[model samples]
Target: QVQLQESGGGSVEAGGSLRLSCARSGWPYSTYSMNWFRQAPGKEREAVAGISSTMSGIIFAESKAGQFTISQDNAKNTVYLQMNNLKPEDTAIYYCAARRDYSLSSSSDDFDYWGQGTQVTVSSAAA
Candidate 1:
């Protein structure tokens, strides 16, 4: 099956922002909604946010409004995700995956699948 893979550094200094990307193989990049998600050190998986193919530039929807941002540069066949204002609590695994829009009934819409995961440990200094 075609899949998405996330590649990036696993560690970062506290108070430092983080950036990551997802590269899809065996499939065209435009076939899916490039998505971003997070799993804090010991917490469950959470959906950060997503963007459509139209708004390729500035994928981040609202950073100041407390939402994660994800964007794609089709020319590079890459998907990018960023999180700023790092804190101890922000240390966790960030992942990039294809957007699989799911509907349990009609009102419920969410993600159902995800990549393995990429760890982002917020460090105290240059660890």
Candidate 2:
């Protein structure tokens, strides 16, 4: 069985930044497609970012995607999700996930395993 665990990320001021890390267990560190999502109160989950062996990017709603980034370090056996210049709207439960099968497709992109998730709080005030 494969598992992902997320750590680091507690609070960040409205104009601040925070980096969250996800570690993989029961699986070898290898190039794989991973994704991140954020769920805010009374709102649907947002697909914030994705990372692959070759490339990675983020897509934000009503805002520039540059604020969010996703990256993987096979050498370190971990993946990272960073949010910069956060806003109060950014406060949510962030999750890191990966597919169970070793394939990528519209149908196969469904994440079977997910990290425990980290609750990120983006205060309305400055840090």
Candidate 3:
């Protein structure tokens, strides 16, 4: 079974930037798909971005495309998600996931495993 661990979540002021990192294990990095998701308090989860080494490019939710960027380092088996121009609404718990099927499409059968999640808070305080 594959395992995912997400790190680097904390407070960021409005209009600031934040970067999250996910490290994977138990499988070859090139052999599966990785995705990032976020859930605000009392809200459903939202897909932020996804990528498959087998595929040519990353996929992002239309609303998130402008502010979110995805990067991966196959040699280190890690994925990095960076978001800029933050707002209070951006506060949420973010997760790293692995798809069950090794498909090129970002959307497959639901994710089989997930990271514990990191809580990110967007405040209006000083940057």
lDDT of 2 at 38: 76
Question: Model 1, range 1-127, lDDT digits (tens) per residue?
Answer: 6667788747766767667887766663344565676677667766566655553423232346433456677777677776676666667777665654321111113443356788888777545
What residue pairs are clashing in model 3? none
Clash pairs (backbone) in predicted model 1: none
Each candidate structure's TM-score, on Cα atoms with residue i matched to residue i, is: 0.70, 0.81, 0.84
Candidate 2 structure quality by residue, lDDT tens digits, 10-116: 88878888988988778754556677777798887776776666555444445565687777787876888877888899899988887644443232248767888
Q: Is candidate 1 or candidate 3 better by TM-score?
A: 3
lDDT of 3: 0.79
lDDT of 2 at 80: 88
Clashes of 1: 0
Cα lDDT of model 3 by residue, 1-127, tens digit:
6778888899988888988999998874446778888889999888878877675336566655558887888888898888898888889999898864555444424787789999999998654
Q: What overall lDDT goes with each candidate model?
A: 0.60, 0.74, 0.79
Report the error of model 3 at residue 40, Å: 0.7
Model 2: residues with Cα > 4 Å off, grouped in runs: 28-31, 58-62, 100-109
1 or 3, which is superior by lDDT? 3
